[PDB]
Design a protein around this motif. Structure first.
Motif, PDB file in Angstrom:
ATOM      1  N   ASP A 120      12.187   5.996 -10.064  1.00  0.00           N
ATOM      2  CA  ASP A 120      12.181   5.880  -8.615  1.00  0.00           C
ATOM      3  C   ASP A 120      12.615   4.436  -8.322  1.00  0.00           C
ATOM      4  O   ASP A 120      11.987   3.483  -8.793  1.00  0.00           O
ATOM      5  N   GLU A 138      12.432   2.272  -5.761  1.00  0.00           N
ATOM      6  CA  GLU A 138      11.881   1.713  -4.533  1.00  0.00           C
ATOM      7  C   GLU A 138      11.682   0.209  -4.679  1.00  0.00           C
ATOM      8  O   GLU A 138      11.333  -0.279  -5.756  1.00  0.00           O
ATOM      9  N   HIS A 139      11.915  -0.517  -3.589  1.00  0.00           N
ATOM     10  CA  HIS A 139      11.746  -1.968  -3.568  1.00  0.00           C
ATOM     11  C   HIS A 139      10.362  -2.348  -4.064  1.00  0.00           C
ATOM     12  O   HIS A 139       9.410  -1.577  -3.942  1.00  0.00           O
ATOM     13  N   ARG A 140      10.254  -3.549  -4.619  1.00  0.00           N
ATOM     14  CA  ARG A 140       8.972  -4.042  -5.091  1.00  0.00           C
ATOM     15  C   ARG A 140       8.106  -4.345  -3.882  1.00  0.00           C
ATOM     16  O   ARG A 140       8.611  -4.539  -2.774  1.00  0.00           O
ATOM     17  N   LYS A 141       6.799  -4.384  -4.101  1.00  0.00           N
ATOM     18  CA  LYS A 141       5.862  -4.688  -3.034  1.00  0.00           C
ATOM     19  C   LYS A 141       5.394  -6.125  -3.227  1.00  0.00           C
ATOM     20  O   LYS A 141       4.870  -6.482  -4.287  1.00  0.00           O
ATOM     21  N   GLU A 165      15.127   0.692   4.300  1.00  0.00           N
ATOM     22  CA  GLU A 165      13.896   1.437   4.531  1.00  0.00           C
ATOM     23  C   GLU A 165      13.895   2.083   5.908  1.00  0.00           C
ATOM     24  O   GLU A 165      14.495   1.565   6.853  1.00  0.00           O
ATOM     25  N   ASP A 197       8.446   1.571   2.849  1.00  0.00           N
ATOM     26  CA  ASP A 197       8.584   2.869   2.196  1.00  0.00           C
ATOM     27  C   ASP A 197       9.339   2.793   0.864  1.00  0.00           C
ATOM     28  O   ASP A 197       9.218   3.687   0.025  1.00  0.00           O
ATOM     29  N   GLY A 198      10.112   1.727   0.677  1.00  0.00           N
ATOM     30  CA  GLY A 198      10.844   1.549  -0.567  1.00  0.00           C
ATOM     31  C   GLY A 198      12.335   1.800  -0.481  1.00  0.00           C
ATOM     32  O   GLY A 198      13.045   1.639  -1.467  1.00  0.00           O
TER      33      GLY A 198
END
Ligand SMILES: [Cl-]
Ligand SMILES: [Cl-]
Ligand SMILES: [Cl-]
Ligand SMILES: [K+]
Ligand SMILES: [Mg+2]
Ligand SMILES: [Mg+2]
Ligand SMILES: [Mg+2]
Ligand SMILES: [Mg+2]
Ligand SMILES: [Mg+2]
Ligand SMILES: [Mg+2]
Ligand SMILES: [Mg+2]
Ligand SMILES: [Mg+2]
Ligand SMILES: [Mg+2]
Ligand SMILES: [Mg+2]
Ligand SMILES: [Mg+2]
Ligand SMILES: [Mg+2]
Ligand SMILES: [Mg+2]
Ligand SMILES: [Mg+2]
Ligand SMILES: [Mg+2]
Ligand SMILES: [Mg+2]
Ligand SMILES: [Mg+2]
Ligand SMILES: [Mg+2]
Ligand SMILES: [Mg+2]
Ligand code: NA
Ligand code: NA
Ligand code: NA
Ligand code: NA
Ligand code: NA
Ligand code: NA
Ligand code: NA
Ligand code: NA
Ligand code: NA
Ligand code: NA
Ligand code: NA
Ligand SMILES: [Sr+2]
Ligand SMILES: [Sr+2]
Ligand SMILES: [Sr+2]
Ligand SMILES: [Sr+2]
Ligand SMILES: [Sr+2]
Ligand SMILES: [Sr+2]
Ligand SMILES: [Sr+2]
Ligand SMILES: [Sr+2]
Ligand SMILES: [Sr+2]
Ligand SMILES: [Sr+2]
Lengths: 237, 119, 194, 46
Positions: free
Chosen positions: A26, A28-31, A109, A114-115
């Motif tokens: 997946d 998705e951008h890092r948090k 996003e 949301d990533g």
RNA sequence: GCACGGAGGCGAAGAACCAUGGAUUUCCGAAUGAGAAUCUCUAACAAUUGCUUCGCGCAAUGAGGAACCCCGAGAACUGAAACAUCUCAGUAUCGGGAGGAACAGAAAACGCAAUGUGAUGUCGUUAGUAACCGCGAGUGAACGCGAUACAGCCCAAACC
RNA sequence: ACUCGUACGGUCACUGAAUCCUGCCCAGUGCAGGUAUCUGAACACCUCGUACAAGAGGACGAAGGACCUGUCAACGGCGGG
RNA sequence: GCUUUACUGCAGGCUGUCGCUGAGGACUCUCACUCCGGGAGGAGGACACCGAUAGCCGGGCA
């Protein structure tokens, strides 16, 4: 009659499922809590089965190894940044608010955090147009003007793999191989070529839909086939 | 909480329980929401106590307004078990009423006043 | 004079007005985050519980149960049916939601027996009921002159056979005369036409 | 195939049941093993 | 033992045989330490509950049973000389549950309207009557009466 | 389910490699858009009726239809004089 | 078995209404409810989802 193929799909049986156990990851951008002090180094470039495009393996400062949705022009060794302060260069991620207008972006996003939902396909990109304190206006690949929260994160640059569509499959065997990497039943048998019992267009001495193809939006599943709620058809006008 | 329209200071609450503790050794006190309720209805009550940690709240929601249309003064206690201990019970008590104090009428008198002032 | 209980009762005659309205608005928020069957230490409607047989004693349990609002959740006929037996939407089940609730509760506590139940409100998509269950094996109950009757063998799983108050009402057993020709002594014995 | 210990015990039993009615049972009853199975002609359970 | 063999044995230390009670009672099986086509692996009420000394310490549930019984889910062939309401039918079949029988049951009843009856089943009758119904085909009670058997009570609240 | 997918996507259909091409028709049917005016159910509302209720009528009026427009690589059509 | 502008119905979709549902023929707000977020918090908001009903379409199905 019998349920049409579109209805067999919904049951989500093996024939219609994506080879998920074979998918890499997946993207998705890092948090990040805040600060932007997050930087990593591209450790490798890999092939993503699910998108027929390249993806980059990054090693972050705090020791987090993760695959990322790579834009065109990213190579091993390069350092990427993700945060509000992140630098404004290809391959870096930061909230739209920090992005300068007129800059092509990807993996945008829909809702902050949301990533990434928009512009993730081969060689595509969204175009950041307008800034504000209440709304960041982006132009998506389909040409649609999308109003987004300036707090929505994105990646500078266009997605890697552009031009993929410019070359023809030339042969069935090639389609075959690609299709086997997707949640899709292929090849395709025309409705008009089936028996009346299997599709709204089946039956008849010669092949031909015995009815208009533009179907109403309100049509139930099993009948909604052909040209769905077409606003028009053909090439004329 | 839905029936509590004002907060009583930990210290004021202190004086009241003590007053109630001596009220049982001297005067007369009622234990239980029902008995407390009848006293207010019969008028044979001087000061009534109502815990604030009562679940469900319906058990005591009526005490406040019933006392107002009966002139009977009332005060809130944070804990349910304290009120029960102060009334001399081995259990808790959602409400309590001091039916005619005893060598405490002086304090009970002041407690009532302090409350009215506290709105 | 009036009992304290009467006040709880009087409040519940209009759960949509006064303090109770605000209490429900608050509670339901928590309830909606609870399970299908939550055991509780004290009845939300004390007067009703005591009135139905409740008692603050060992072996007496009370549990709140929630159930989806509305009619039946039926599947359309896969085989041929005459217009009459094709209906699907407006068809409703024969047991009221309170009964479904009593049964779920009793399943959660296999060893306990449903004594009675009552409503504690609902929102737009579900209904809550509290159920009083009794432990027929606890001596504190085997000795109670008011509850030991529920200890008899034939009272086992009473709820599953309609022996509950809600059970009996729903079976059309209220009236003793006109209108109960096909309900008494049982629906089954009357060919199932009640 | 690979037989488990249990499977093997059941096979053994079946084999044993496949023996004949002892001669003396004949004399004693003054005059057939109604369960005479054959590996080829028959098919056992499992 | 069935079972009328050969050999050998037991029984007056009273066997066989029968009744009653007790002992033993492998593995799988609700199957319950975990797993498994009846075996295996490393101390066991697994799981859900009540009580609780908050420790599985004390307990409950689970599965079976010819049908009968109670609560739910619920067809179609068929009849109507077609067929849709209706019929077959709340039948077949399915889910859940109790007992030796179940369920019902001491009137917010009845309404031979009375100065009358007096919990509830059930049996006979009331009656194919009243009522229903493409008012078609068909469906179809009750009160009462004669019987069987009879039995009436306990809470919630007030006051403590 | 599609989907560790996001318009260079994937869903629904038609035609069936390349090459040279693909005319006319929107009246009917289908889909879609619009719509002053017309028509358009129930709840609430108003009038009559009923010591109440049944019921009758009115006012308002959504989608839909009437009406107008777009559309044939949409169903299809391209005749007689 | 299959078809359709056969008869009669049933799913399903669209649409109005009532409940969920709050405060100050067009409007603001936040507190239910919804969604995004690891969290803080953000977005939306009495709408939407859901229950009920009404009109329209409705060989997808009987
Ligand atoms: Cl493709
Ligand atoms: Cl039960
Ligand atoms: Cl009589
Ligand atoms: K029929
Ligand atoms: Mg991803
Ligand atoms: Mg495949
Ligand atoms: Mg094809
Ligand atoms: Mg063919
Ligand atoms: Mg078809
Ligand atoms: Mg063709
Ligand atoms: Mg007593
Ligand atoms: Mg019976
Ligand atoms: Mg051998
Ligand atoms: Mg095991
Ligand atoms: Mg016929
Ligand atoms: Mg019928
Ligand atoms: Mg006829
Ligand atoms: Mg009948
Ligand atoms: Mg009668
Ligand atoms: Mg072709
Ligand atoms: Mg071909
Ligand atoms: Mg979510
Ligand atoms: Mg058909
Ligand atoms: Na139970
Ligand atoms: Na064999
Ligand atoms: Na034995
Ligand atoms: Na046990
Ligand atoms: Na334990
Ligand atoms: Na016939
Ligand atoms: Na026929
Ligand atoms: Na009929
Ligand atoms: Na007579
Ligand atoms: Na046309
Ligand atoms: Na056929
Ligand atoms: Sr995602
Ligand atoms: Sr995520
Ligand atoms: Sr055809
Ligand atoms: Sr053209
Ligand atoms: Sr207590
Ligand atoms: Sr049981
Ligand atoms: Sr063979
Ligand atoms: Sr009698
Ligand atoms: Sr060609
Ligand atoms: Sr047209």
């Amino acid at each position: 009659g019998r349920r049409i193929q579109g209805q067999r799909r919904g049951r989500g049986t093996s024939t219609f499922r994506a080879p998920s156990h074979r998918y890499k990851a997946d993207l998705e951008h890092r948090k990040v809590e805040d600060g932007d002090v997050i930087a990593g180094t591209v450790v490798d470039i890999e092939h993503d089965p699910a998108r027929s495009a390249p993806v980059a393996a990054v090693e972050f400062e705090d020791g987090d190894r993760r695959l990322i949705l790579a834009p065109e022009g990213v190579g091993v060794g390069d350092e990427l940044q993700v945060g509000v302060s992140a630098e404004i260069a290809p391959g870096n991620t930061l909230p739209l608010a920090e992005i300068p207008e007129g800059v092509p972006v990807c993996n945008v996003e829909s809702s902050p955090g949301d990533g990434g939902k928009f512009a993730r396909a081969s060689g595509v990109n969204a175009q950041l147009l307008t800034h504000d304190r209440n709304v960041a206006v982006v132009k998506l690949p389909s040409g649609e003007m999308k109003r987004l929260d300036p707090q929505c994160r994105a990646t500078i640059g266009v997605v890697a793999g552009g031009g993929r569509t410019d070359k023809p499959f030339v042969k069935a065997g090639n389609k075959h191989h690609k299709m086997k990497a997707r949640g899709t039943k292929w090849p395709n048998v025309r409705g008009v070529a089936m028996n009346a019992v299997d599709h709204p267009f089946g039956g008849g001495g010669r092949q031909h839909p015995g009815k208009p193809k533009s179907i109403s939006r309100n049509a139930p599943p099993g009948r909604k086939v052909g040209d769905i709620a077409s606003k028009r058809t053909g090439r004329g006008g | 909480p839905v029936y509590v329209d004002f907060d009583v200071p930990a210290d004021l609450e202190d004086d009241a329980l003590e007053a109630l503790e001596v009220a049982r050794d001297t005067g007369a006190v009622k234990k239980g929401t029902n008995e407390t309720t009848k006293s207010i209805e019969r008028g044979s009550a001087e000061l009534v106590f109502v815990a604030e940690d009562v679940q469900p709240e319906e058990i005591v929601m009526h005490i406040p307004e019933l006392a107002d249309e009966k002139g009977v003064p009332f005060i809130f206690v944070e804990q349910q078990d304290d009120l029960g201990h102060a009334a001399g019970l081995e259990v808790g008590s959602a409400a309590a009423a001091v039916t005619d104090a005893g060598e405490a009428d002086a304090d009970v008198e002041d407690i009532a006043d302090k409350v009215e002032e506290l709105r | 004079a009036r009992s304290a209980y009467s006040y709880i009762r009087d409040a519940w005659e209009n759960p949509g007005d006064g303090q109770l309205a605000e209490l429900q608005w608050q509670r339901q928020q928590e309830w909606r985050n609870e399970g299908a069957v939550e055991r509780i230490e004290r009845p939300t409607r004390l007067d009703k519980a005591r009135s139905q047989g409740y008692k603050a004693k060992q072996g007496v349990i009370v549990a709140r149960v929630s159930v989806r609002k509305g009619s039946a959740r039926k599947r359309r006929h896969k085989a041929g049916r005459r217009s009459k037996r094709q209906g699907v939407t407006r068809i409703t089940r024969r047991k009221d939601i309170q009964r479904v609730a009593e049964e779920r509760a009793s399943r959660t506590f296999p060893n306990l027996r449903v004594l009675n139940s009552y409503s504690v409100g609902q929102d737009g998509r579900q209904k809550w009921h509290e159920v009083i269950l009794i432990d027929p094996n606890h001596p504190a109950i085997q000795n109670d002159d008011d509850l030991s009757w529920i200890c008899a063998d034939d009272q086992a799983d009473r709820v599953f056979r309609g022996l509950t108050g809600a059970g009996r009402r729903n079976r059309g057993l209220s009236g003793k005369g006109k209108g109960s020709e096909k309900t008494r002594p049982s629906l089954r014995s009357n060919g199932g036409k009640a | 195939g690979k037989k488990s210990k249990a499977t093997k015990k059941r096979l053994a039993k079946l084999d044993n049941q496949n023996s004949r009615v002892p001669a003396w049972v004949m004399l004693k009853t003054d005059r057939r093993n109604h369960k005479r199975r054959h590996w080829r002609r028959n098919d056992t359970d499992e």
